[PDB]
From a paper:
HIV-1 reverse transcriptase (RT) (hereinafter referred to as RT) plays an essential role in the viral life cycle by reverse transcribing the single-stranded RNA genome to a double-stranded DNA copy. There are two main types of RT inhibitors: nucleoside RT inhibitors (NRTIs), which act as chain terminators and compete with incoming nucleotides in the polymerase active site, and non-nucleoside RT inhibitors (NNRTIs), which inhibit the activity of RT noncompetitively. NNRTIs are a group of structurally diverse compounds that bind to the non-nucleoside inhibitor-binding pocket (NNIBP) located ~10 Å from the polymerase active site.
To assess whether mutations against which RPV loses considerable potency would be susceptible to 25a, we tested the inhibitory activities of 25a and RPV against K101P RT, Y181I RT and K103N/Y181I RT, which were shown to cause substantial reduction in susceptibility to RPV. As expected, all three mutations dramatically lower the anti-RT potency of RPV and cause 20-fold, 90-fold and 1805-fold change in the IC50 values, respectively. With respect to K101P RT, the deprotonation of Pro101 main-chain nitrogen attenuates its water-mediated hydrogen bond with the pyrimidine nitrogen in 25a. Nonetheless, the Lys to Pro substitution places its cyclic side chain in the vicinity of the central thiophene pyrimidine ring of 25a and leads to enhanced hydrophobic interactions. More importantly, Lys to Pro substitution will abrogate the critical hydrogen bond between the pyrimidine nitrogen of RPV and the backbone nitrogen in RT due to deprotonated form of Pro101 main-chain nitrogen and hence its inability to act as a hydrogen bond donor.
Numbering used by the authors:
A (entry chain B): 4 to 213, 227 to 428
B (entry chain A): -1 to 554
Amino acid sequence: PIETVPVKLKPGMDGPKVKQWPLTEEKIKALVEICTEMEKEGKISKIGPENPYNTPVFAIKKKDSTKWRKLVDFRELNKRTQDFWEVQLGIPHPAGLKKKKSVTVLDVGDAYFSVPLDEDFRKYTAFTIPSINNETPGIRYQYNVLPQGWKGSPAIFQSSMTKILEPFKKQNPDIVIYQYMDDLYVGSDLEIGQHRTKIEELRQHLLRWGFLWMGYELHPDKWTVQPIVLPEKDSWTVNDIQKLVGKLNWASQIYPGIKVRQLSKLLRGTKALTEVIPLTEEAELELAENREILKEPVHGVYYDPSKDLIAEIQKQGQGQWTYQIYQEPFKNLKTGKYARMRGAHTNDVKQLTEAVQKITTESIVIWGKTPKFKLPIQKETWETWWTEYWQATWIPEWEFVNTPPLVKLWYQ
Amino acid sequence: MVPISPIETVPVKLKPGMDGPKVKQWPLTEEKIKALVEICTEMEKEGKISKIGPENPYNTPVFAIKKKDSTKWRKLVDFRELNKRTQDFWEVQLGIPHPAGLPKKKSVTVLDVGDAYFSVPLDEDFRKYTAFTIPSINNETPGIRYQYNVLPQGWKGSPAIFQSSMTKILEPFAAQNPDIVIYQYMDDLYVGSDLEIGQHRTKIEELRQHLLRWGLTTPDKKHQKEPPFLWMGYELHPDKWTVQPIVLPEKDSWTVNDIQKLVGKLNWASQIYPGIKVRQLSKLLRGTKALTEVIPLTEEAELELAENREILKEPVHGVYYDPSKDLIAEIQKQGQGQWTYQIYQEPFKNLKTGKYARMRGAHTNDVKQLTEAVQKITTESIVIWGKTPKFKLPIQKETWETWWTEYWQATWIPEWEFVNTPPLVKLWYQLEKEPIVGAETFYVDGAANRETKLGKAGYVTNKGRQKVVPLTNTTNQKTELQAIYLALQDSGLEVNIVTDSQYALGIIQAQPDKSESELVNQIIEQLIKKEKVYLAWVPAHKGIGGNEQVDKLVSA
Ligand SMILES: Cc1cc(/C=C/C#N)cc(C)c1Oc1nc(NC2CCN(Cc3ccc(S(N)(=O)=O)cc3)CC2)nc2ccsc12
Ligand SMILES: [Mg+2]
């Protein structure tokens, strides 16, 4: 591949100028070894002071790996890169990937390094390996090949990728392969034993066309909108009924015909919170009607690819996290819950960081894009620590919730 | 002649679509012209500048200035216009090391690389943009026109291009001599080592021999400064460091400017002088642009200034960094939302100190502020030492565990240990998770008229207790909090409180221990006095008894 595909930024937009955040000595040393080798292989080159652009870089360890790996925060450059009608009018997102029994994700990021980057755009991929305590100037590089994490890399490589895969795709009409950034999502409907073969069969097929031995295994048959459920009790205290009425009042923003007044009439008077109240039959009926309403799907919920996906996360305690993906309030496209984050029973931020990555992976598989996160955490705590637990080669956007939402109760 | 390597040229462009400067040359006096001709003739003989023809259309004005006793003229070429039209550069000298991160060095020499600066060539295709004109005597001949062949002093790209060229020249010498450090600042290169001073001077002229490859003369710095080094506001001694002397002026009349230049010295001194506090003297700074305003000191402002100068009475120093020892950071609460910290490796020998002030909020608590301080120190330490320090914090391990397991936000602080240094950060109240059996249940509500600001707040309970209080100059949100306050006031040690105020519940669920609002503060003080409080929320106007009953009582 000698020829360059011409790329440029959006109109009236300069290249990124994002400050590099401080790094630990061991991450700096890891990056120095990684970049020295990349320089010898010609993937990157030293740049001079005539390049004022910058994109942040740090070091990562991927799932079950002891090798340091470099990750570039290309979020700004991706925003500023020309909108890619990626060799096409676009590929329709494989709606069938989200319905196949198992999905295996493969890091095919190395394939990018074998195709060259447009000579005029390389300047915009500039990054800095920072020094400690400003004791030397930062080491300044730019890319010569398609870098991992860049919007243009999957687009530019799509012609070669679709060619590499066609023999395997021609053999298997039932395997659905999807590409998002540096990752290949391989989803079949056969059982695990032959599934690890056919990904190894595709794996082994790739190396012949010019890797990482690695993978991740998903099961999108699960991914629904978790129903709202009400308690089933033989004796209701005043407090129980007050919570039920609150939850039903909230649910009535989502569901039509939710009624509360028969349950409200159980609370005639000024009663102690712990006093048991017997349900009337009109209140039992009303509670029953509410139960039936809550088992239907919500009306008029549709994905609009012109709007952002929004993901909210609530810390529920004891390693449990609830989350909802939507585009407009109360029209949940997907809800879920996580428990016992592996290797983090003592670290809230590690758990939250793993939840963000899981939710983003589900969002890629369902809609082919990442959601905008609303994180229950102060900006300064998240910003200090998330890079320590990040393991994906993409990075989504996030905002911070500083007021405790009342609705954490309702997803309990 | 011994061949010398060329210093590789940096390509330079103007800002896109922008052209070079076209500024008129000022008229000068005959004595200034004569001075500029002599000055420019010598730089021309040294290659710095070159004469050009009349085709070049660009121009940048020249000046001649004097000094007090220095009875000589000196050229000034005003590149303000060319700088506005020159591309942005990678300015790679913005950050400067902090002394607490530096390891000690047995020996340090200083070389002057001033002459080296002029052997860095300016990009050939860009020189036309640096053209300037010496006006002629009596304006009777064409003015002498020159352009630069080297980086001009005062031009936008000169510092970045110069330091980049030196760094590239120095890179192989540093890499092949790992037992020395080399640091650039101005026209001076600092070389430190830990080897015996004989091996040091050999490495030094080994470096000069290396610089000769590109033909750069580098003698020792004239009038060699004995320690301490006076550099970026510090005093670098061979084994200790401190800031340059902090002397706090004596004044009967403090103005905005006299006030804001003290906090500067205080902020600068807070990196080594422990316990510096700035809030009260800072507070007088909240909103004024007239810097001559004489605003009196509160006697909390006088107390902390006096509290300062007692800390500034004797000089104190930081130690330099030893990578073989652990890095430890200790924090103290000081009151009114400010915190101090010390970072050290061995007890009583601080690397540096510092302080943290609370973020401007309506409500807050000590644990959140301590957490913020921890993150700031964490980030500072990664900057200075490339690692997170071990923390010593004045909060009990059980207090932190209770806080983060129950707080609605995700939170984390790195490896730390309790240090019993009062005052201790603590949680001041904890709401119940379940209603309290046997405790009185207070149904509270408040309401206000948006126009007349008249309102009511009150409660009704299961034991028939009731109260409604009329209020003036109030809001809906205020009466809702006042209703909760009355219930706390009038209940025993254990109490269930039922509110429909999402506003009140959002404040209390944030767990503040102090507020801008005295009403919230009064509620906090009530919560501290209780043994158990269960706070329940219901939606308003759904006929929830107790809440329906009190809602009618307080709504007009
Ligand atoms: C080497 C150096 C010098 C300066 C001075 C500027 C001025 N004006 C600044 C920096 C950032 C330097 O850069 C590094 N400095 C250090 N350590 C220092 C070296 C100096 N000592 C003070 C001292 C020691 C010995 C003598 S003596 N006995 O020779 O007279 C006199 C003074 C304090 C610590 N470490 C590193 C590591 C990587 S860069 C770098
Ligand atoms: Mg009301």
